[PDB]
């Protein structure tokens, strides 16, 4: 649970750094949340602290401080193949889109929908697409 605790502490300290009116979240806050987790573990009568105790401690600290479409997915998939090139092969994009769990009909529908916006142009041979 240390890694999750580290990530949660980083998130909380980043939030406290973004807000000027928040209390200074030094290592004392981490000590306090660790004490809260240990107290919760004692309360539940367990010799090992579980993630539920950490979640409850985070929730309590947050309450205390508070008291004060297929078209887009296919466009992103073909956007992943824009690594330094203006034109993308039709076969590669078709194979990659199908591997993501989309039927070729939805691929054609997404191609037409983003093609109406004229983001790109497709060759009639359906072999290459030049991105406008």
């Amino acid at each position: 649970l240390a890694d999750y605790i580290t990530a949660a502490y980083v998130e909380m300290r980043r939030e406290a750094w973004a807000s000027k009116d928040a209390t200074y979240t030094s290592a004392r806050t981490l000590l306090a949340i660790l004490r809260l987790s240990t107290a919760l573990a004692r309360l539940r009568m367990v010799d090992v602290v579980e993630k539920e105790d950490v979640n409850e401690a985070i929730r309590l600290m947050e309450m205390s401080k508070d008291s004060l479409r297929p078209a887009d997915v296919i466009f992103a998939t073909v956007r992943e193949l824009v690594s330094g090139g203006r034109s993308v092969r039709f076969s590669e994009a078709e194979q990659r889109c199908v591997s993501r769990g989309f039927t070729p009909a939805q691929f054609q529908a997404a191609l037409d929908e983003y093609e109406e916006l004229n983001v790109w142009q497709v060759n009639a041979s359906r072999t290459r697409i030049t991105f406008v």
């Binding site: 004229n118 060759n123 406008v132």
Partner: peptide, 14 residues
Amino acid sequence: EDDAIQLVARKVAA
């Protein structure tokens, strides 16, 4: 070719 014509018209539209 139809492809050049379509692309030119589409660029002009956009």
